[PDB]
Structures are given as C-alpha cells and as structure tokens.
C-alpha cells in the first residue's frame, strides 16, 4: 500500500532559489522564502499567489508560522530574523544578535519564544513580545543547520555540519543529550517526531536516520536519495499512511514507508535540487521547492 501523490500546481514567482516552504497550522496558506530576499504567501488549496512580504536586506533561508497562523518568523543572511504580521505584511520586530547568517528558525508551540540557528555556530532563544535575545547557546563548532522545538516546547533539537545533533532544555539552555556517530558525517537537518519521542536527522552521506534520543538508539535508516551538500528539509507525513518525506539532490521528492524503510514513491517534475518539502496538517498534500534552475514550488495531492 503506497501513496499516489500527483502534481496539482506549480507556483512561480520567486526570482532566485527557493529555500523553505511551510504550511500554516490551520492549513489554509503556504509560506515560502527565497534567496531573492522575499517571503511569498500562497493559497494551499488553489495554489493562488496571495502576497509578497519584503524587508530583509539579503536572502532568507527559512520561515516558520506561529500557532495562530498569522505571525511568521524568517531567518536571513542579513544576520537578523524578522517577525511579521502576515495579515498586514508588516515587520513587527527585527531580532538582532547573531554575528553571521541565520539559517533556521521556529516558534515554540506556545508561540512566545523563537529559536534560531546560525552560521555563527550558536543557537539563540528569543522573546517574541520584546524581541530580546533571552539565551545564546554555544551549541556547535560549525554552522547550525536546523533547530526545532518538541511538542510542548520544553526541548530544542539542533543539528550542525560539525556532525552532532544536540537536545537542549529550553528553560535552562542546558545540553541534555549529544548524539554522535563514529565517521561523524555533517548533519544537515533535524526535527522531532510529532510525539516528541524521536528525532529524524539527515546526514550528508545520503542517509536519513530515526533516533530514540533518550536511549541513543538508531531505530530506522532511510536511503536511496541524494544528499551530500545541502540542508534538505524532511518530514513525517501523518494525515494518511505513515511516511517519511524528503527532497533530494537528484531533483526528486522521496517518500518512504516509516516502518519498512522502503521507498514508496519518487515525485518527478522539478528541474533542480529539491531543497524543501512540507506536509499539510490535515490533507494528504505535499509542497516541494527547488533551487535556481527551477525556482518553483509544487503542490502534490494523494489519496493516502
């Protein structure tokens, strides 16, 4: 039993590589960021372009939605993050403190904190209300590739090209667990599972791994795609069948069975590296985005 994702829309408008796509928690919008310094908003169901949000001085690596589906945070090469009111398009706050490119960001579930990771090798935790940096974590010894809060915001996971994944206590900023691998390949992406018990980590040896971080045990490995250079976003798909979804440097979206680890679908259509994928919160819909030869976002729909 396999999904049957088929192409529904191709969304054009970005003028450089797309860097990230994320669905709103309420499912109605997709937000995308790009090396073109812009955030764009698109209808999730009809793929209709809604608006452009501008203000950053350099390219944007990541965007993320608050739980209310109306604030967005973005991470830019201009060394800042910005918090935006999507309704108005206005920048509410600029979060200053990183000393180099900001690569990744996320709100906590409560929507009162933002976590960021940077080329400066640090993870920062920011107060949404005041825009002040609450904590600077000396997290890694190379750029931070991803940061993600768990289900209740009590923990942060971070990854780095230094080859480590680390689990942090949010309130105290303490490192509770370092996950290591002999051979030490750069970790290009990480996120918690929906229940918070596992982390899914991508390494630049063409491998995704599902870890029980408390036990330091690797439970599943997903292979067969190409990932040797970029932070490529991966996802747990949970609306129908239980899948793992990722982009790939061979221009395809890969979908695996979470339990069996078999590749169940490869989605063809992009003409450059698929840098980012996102899974819709309630429908069997995937968004995918690609680098400069392509510059488009695609929306795909499945029966399961």
UniProtKB/Swiss-Prot annotation:
Gene Ontology BP term (one): regulation of cell division
Subcellular location: Nucleus
Pfam families: Beta-prop_WDR5
Cross-link entry Glycyl lysine isopeptide (Lys-Gly) (interchain with G-Cter in SUMO2), positions: 16
GO annotation, cellular component aspect: ATAC complex; histone acetyltransferase complex; histone methyltransferase complex; mitotic spindle; MLL1 complex; MLL1/2 complex; MLL3/4 complex; NSL complex
Residues the record marks as site: Important for interaction with histone H3: 77, 103, 233, 292
Keyword Phosphoprotein recorded: no
Entry similarity comment: Belongs to the WD repeat WDR5/wds family.
Full protein name: WD repeat-containing protein 5
Species, as recorded: Homo sapiens
